C-alpha cells in the first residue's frame, strides 16, 4: 500500500513513543504529588448541566474570569462507587495535560459539597450541535474522531481508561476543537477492572456481561461515537437500557446506506465483540486505527498541533456567554453548618 511513505510513518511512530515517554514522566510527577479556593470567591451565573449527584458557570470575583464549576453533594456521593470515582476524577484531572482535555484550575471542599473548577469552554456540547444539525459529514466526524483517537492514545499510555465517551461529554472550544470533560469514570488501571459503569448506548459487551475488562472498552465506545456522529443516532438504539444491552451483545450492527465502505470497515473492527479482533486491542495497538483507510487524509501531527481548519467555529458573543448551552432548572445551592462525610472524603 505504501511506497518512502512508510519511512515517514515509521519515524512518526518513533516520535510518538518519545512524546508518550515524556508525557508519562510529567504525569507521574503530578500524580504522586498533587483547597486552591473557596466558594465565596465566585459568583453564581448559570447551570450548564445536571446529573444524578451539577456543573455551574461561575465568575471569579477577584480576576473576573469565568469557569465551569462542578458541584458534588458529599452525602449524595454514596451511591458507593461514586466515592472512589469522585477521587479518581480529581486526581486524574490534576495530573493530565493534553490539548483536548479540559483543564482543572482549582478544587476544594466544604461542609456539604466537593468543587472542581475547570476552564469554561463556551462553544457548547457536541451533543446539542449534533442533535440540531442531525448528522455530521464524514470529514466533519473524522476531524472530531481524530482528536479522540489521540486523546485515548495519550490516556491509555498513562494506564488511564476514560469509560464515558459520548457527545454529551465533548465540548467545542473557540477554535472548533474538542475538549473532553467529565472524568467521573476515568480510572488508572494496569490490567483489568470490574466496575459496571458507563452510559448504556456506549457500553462494550464485556462490561454488560460482567467480565473483567480493559482499555479496549474505550475503543468500542469510539466506534459508537463515530457511528452516532455520522448517522445522527447510535448503533444500538432502543427505548429501554435492557433492550440496548441485548443489541450490543448480539454482535450485529446495521449501517445507513450513506456510510462509505471505508467507514463501515472501520466501524466493524471497532464494534467487534471478539477482543482478539477489536482494533485498538491488537499487536499494533492504536496504529491499526490511525493507519486505517478512513483516516488516510488525516494529518495526525497537524491535528495535535491544532493546525487543521475546523469544520465549525461556534459563535461567541463575549466572556461568560452561555448561548451555546441548553437551559436547566436553577436549584438552590446550600451549605450546612455541620461538616458531612468528613472522613469519607479526607483525600479530596
Amino acid at each position: 500500500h505504501m511506497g518512502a511513505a512508510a519511512a515517514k510513518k515509521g519515524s512518526e511512530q518513533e516520535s510518538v513513543k518519545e512524546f508518550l515517554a515524556k508525557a508519562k514522566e510529567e504525569f507521574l510527577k503530578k500524580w504522586e504529588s498533587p483547597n486552591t479556593a473557596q466558594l465565596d470567591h465566585f459568583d453564581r451565573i448559570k447551570t450548564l448541566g445536571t446529573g444524578s449527584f451539577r456543573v455551574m458557570l461561575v465568575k471569579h470575583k477577584e480576576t473576573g474570569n469565568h469557569y465551569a464549576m462542578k458541584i458534588l453533594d458529599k452525602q449524595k456521593v454514596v451511591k458507593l462507587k461514586q466515592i472512589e470515582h469522585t477521587l479518581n476524577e480529581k486526581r486524574i484531572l490534576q495530573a493530565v495535560n493534553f490539548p483536548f482535555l479540559v483543564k482543572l484550575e482549582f478544587s476544594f471542599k466544604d461542609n456539604s459539597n466537593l468543587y472542581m473548577v475547570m476552564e469554561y469552554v463556551p462553544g457548547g456540547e457536541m451533543f446539542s450541535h449534533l442533535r440540531r444539525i442531525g448528522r455530521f459529514s464524514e470529514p466533519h466526524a473524522r476531524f472530531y474522531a481524530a482528536q479522540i483517537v489521540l486523546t485515548f492514545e495519550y490516556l491509555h499510555s498513562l494506564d488511564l481508561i476514560y469509560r464515558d465517551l459520548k457527545p454529551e461529554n465533548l465540548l467545542i472550544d473557540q477554535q472548533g476543537y474538542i475538549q473532553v470533560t467529565d472524568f467521573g469514570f476515568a480510572k488508572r488501571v494496569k490490567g483489568r477492572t470490574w466496575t459496571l459503569c458507563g452510559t448504556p448506548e456506549y457500553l462494550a459487551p464485556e462490561i454488560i456481561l460482567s467480565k473483567g475488562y480493559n482499555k479496549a472498552v474505550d475503543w468500542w465506545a469510539l466506534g459508537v461515537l463515530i457511528y452516532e456522529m455520522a448517522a445522527g443516532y447510535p448503533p444500538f438504539f432502543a427505548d429501554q437500557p435492557i433492550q440496548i444491552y441485548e443489541k450490543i451483545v448480539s454482535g450485529k450492527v446495521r449501517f445507513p446506506s450513506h456510510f462509505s465502505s471505508d467507514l463501515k470497515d472501520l466501524l466493524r473492527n471497532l464494534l467487534q465483540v471478539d477482543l482478539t479482533k477489536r482494533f485498538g486491542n491488537l499487536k499494533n495497538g492504536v496504529n491499526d486505527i490511525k493507519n486505517h483507510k478512513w483516516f488516510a487524509t488525516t494529518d495526525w501531527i497537524a491535528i495535535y498541533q491544532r493546525k487543521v481548519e475546523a469544520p465549525f467555529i461556534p459563535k461567541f458573543k463575549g466572556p461568560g456567554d452561555t448561548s451555546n448551552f441548553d437551559d436547566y432548572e436553577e436549584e438552590e445551592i446550600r451549605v450546612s453548618i455541620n461538616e458531612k462525610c468528613g472522613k469519607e472524603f479526607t483525600e479530596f
Binding site: 446529573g51 459496571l196 437500557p241
Partner: peptide
C-alpha cells in the same frame, strides 16, 4: 427505529 434522543445519564454500579 425508536430510541433515546435526549441526554443520556451514565450508570455507576447497576445496569438495569
Amino acid at each position: 427505529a425508536a430510541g433515546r434522543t435526549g441526554r443520556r445519564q451514565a450508570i455507576h454500579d447497576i445496569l438495569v
